[PDB]
Structure 1
Amino acid sequence: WEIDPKDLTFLKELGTGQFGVVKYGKWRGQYDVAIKMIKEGSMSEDEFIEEAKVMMNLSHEKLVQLYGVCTKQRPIFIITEYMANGCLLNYLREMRHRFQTQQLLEMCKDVCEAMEYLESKQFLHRDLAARNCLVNDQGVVKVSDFGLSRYVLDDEYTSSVGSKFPVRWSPPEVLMYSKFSSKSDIWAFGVLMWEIYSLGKMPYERFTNSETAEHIAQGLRLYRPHLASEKVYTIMYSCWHEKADERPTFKILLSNILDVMDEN
């Protein structure tokens, strides 16, 4: 969907991301949207435009929808669903003292539903983390910016030794071989559950990226957050098998989470 930029009203600055400026606005004076203004040089644009239909056709209640693009001008725009509560990582830290454990599990379920959908579509997120989940006005968590890491033009982000590469969310085979698969998203999802249950702490805080890489390659795993039951920790820990083929699918994780909910 090529959106007519005349149909967009910019209303508020939402900050800056790895493509530059993002704004809150309305489409046809009614629907809230977020608008990424793709900073020139920041994205592999012809690759993106060439491949974006698959990403727009991803449709699920727990994905932050890509509604369309504006490509007949520069900078190009990516128009998405608007999420009033911003990123999950901040939401966790801001409301840290208010969450009940049932709500944390619900958040895990939301993310797991989105990822099971993506898995079913053989579509990789590649940068799953609380910072890449957003929260709407009703506390529903949704997965954002799935697939976009592929188009990033920034050596600090694209190199596994870059300062921006999501090392703390990456399995050994990504760190060593750049081998992304369903099972590297699984690993990241485990780390995301850990961010949720730790109420937004940084994974491997006080370790550098390279120290993190070194020690996880040797078997170091994130400790159980105080708020995680042993059953919940078992679920997140299952995502961290050194060998990719020993990790669960998102279908299995979803069943695991639903079982805990029913037990609860």
Structure 2
Amino acid sequence: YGSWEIDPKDLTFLKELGTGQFGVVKYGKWRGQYDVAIKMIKEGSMSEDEFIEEAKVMMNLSHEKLVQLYGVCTKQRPIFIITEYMANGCLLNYLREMRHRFQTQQLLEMCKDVCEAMEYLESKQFLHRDLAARNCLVNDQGVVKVSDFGLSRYVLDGSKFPVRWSPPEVLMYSKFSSKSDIWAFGVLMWEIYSLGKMPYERFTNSETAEHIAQGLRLYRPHLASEKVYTIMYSCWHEKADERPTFKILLSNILDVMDEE
């Protein structure tokens, strides 16, 4: 077993958490004690050899606000991805549960959680490439963490492309960069302050792409202060080089935290 490789005999499977296009995710214990999520990858869905090689680099990405990769099980099929367990599940579903009755201070803390993770990835020159609330998870303490960073590079399956999280230069020319992650982060802040509404909810993807290329934008969620709106809107400059960095976004968010 290599350092990126977990012995599947060390896993105890306890509950199913969800089933989707990338496979089935289960809750279990590692060596009888440690909570893990076990992702069993659907056969034929991923470029598995490429994914395994990249898993070695993913092992070295570690930040309190990134969902932790513990290792992979690749000797058998389906391959397993072993990750940090996040008891409260997907951020998008969490936002849509109105019983939480969130205060805006809690919403800003979720944005800061994500921005800290994203600042760390930026410092490692690592792109998420599909940042959205559906790819964030929530633990039992209510902390939001960023998941599936870089995963889309290995998905073999466009009618399912994240149009609504993409800047004009991605939609027009497939120009991915740090600044396309910045754009997506702004949409993610909009999702959080909108309690999980679909961005451009009344539009199709094709209509959204035309809207955005014409220079039109999402507008202020009811729960976002003017200062919070300024931060998310700064992510959507037509010119990619005029968008901030995640370091600057984090500073701006911390400043608003103090003021509010």
Asked if structure 1 preserves the Cα contact closer than 8 Å seen for 2:55 and 2:71, the reply is no
Alpha-carbon separation, structure 1, partners of 2:192 and 2:19: 23
Stretch moving more, 93-102 or 231-240 = 93-102
Asked if structure 1 preserves the Cα contact closer than 8 Å seen for 2:132 and 2:188, the reply is yes
Q: 1:96 to 1:193 in 2, by over 3 A?
A: farther
Alpha-carbon separation, structure 2, partners of 1:235 and 1:55: 29
TM-score by length of 1: 0.95
Asked if structure 2 preserves the Cα contact closer than 8 Å seen for 1:64 and 1:143, the reply is yes
Give the superposition deviation at 1:96. Answer: 5.8
Give the superposition deviation at 1:17. Answer: 3.1
Point out where structure 1 has 5 or more consecutive residues left out of the alignment: 154-161
Cα-to-partner distance string for 1:228-260 (whole Å, 9 max, x where unaligned):
000000000000001111100000000000001
Asked if structure 2 preserves the Cα contact closer than 8 Å seen for 1:88 and 1:134, the reply is yes
Cα-to-partner distance string for 1:173-217 (whole Å, 9 max, x where unaligned):
111121111110000000000000001100001211011011101
Identity fraction in percent:
100
Moved over 6 A (4+): none
Asked if structure 2 preserves the Cα contact closer than 8 Å seen for 1:96 and 1:199, the reply is no
Asked if structure 1 preserves the Cα contact closer than 8 Å seen for 2:166 and 2:180, the reply is yes
Asked if structure 2 preserves the Cα contact closer than 8 Å seen for 1:20 and 1:38, the reply is yes
Give the superposition deviation at 1:163. Answer: 2.1
Point out where structure 2 has 5 or more consecutive residues left out of the alignment: none
Alpha-carbon separation, structure 2, partners of 1:14 and 1:40: 19
Give the superposition deviation at 1:132. Answer: 0.4
The DSSP-based 3-state class of the residue aligned with 1:96 is: helix
Give the superposition deviation at 1:18. Answer: 3.4
Alpha-carbon separation, structure 1, partners of 2:56 and 2:26: 22
The two structures, once aligned, show a CA RMSD in angstroms of: 0.9
Asked if structure 2 preserves the Cα contact closer than 8 Å seen for 1:55 and 1:147, the reply is no
Give the superposition deviation at 1:19. Answer: 1.4
1:186 aligns to what?
182
Asked if structure 2 preserves the Cα contact closer than 8 Å seen for 1:19 and 1:38, the reply is yes
1:209 aligns to what?
205
Aligned counterparts, 1:39-188, within 5 A: 39-95=42-98, 98-153=101-156, 162-188=158-184
1:159 aligns to what?
none
Aligned residues: 256
Asked if structure 2 preserves the Cα contact closer than 8 Å seen for 1:92 and 1:196, the reply is yes
Asked if structure 1 preserves the Cα contact closer than 8 Å seen for 2:164 and 2:199, the reply is yes
Give the superposition deviation at 1:97. Answer: 5.5
Asked if structure 1 preserves the Cα contact closer than 8 Å seen for 2:130 and 2:152, the reply is yes
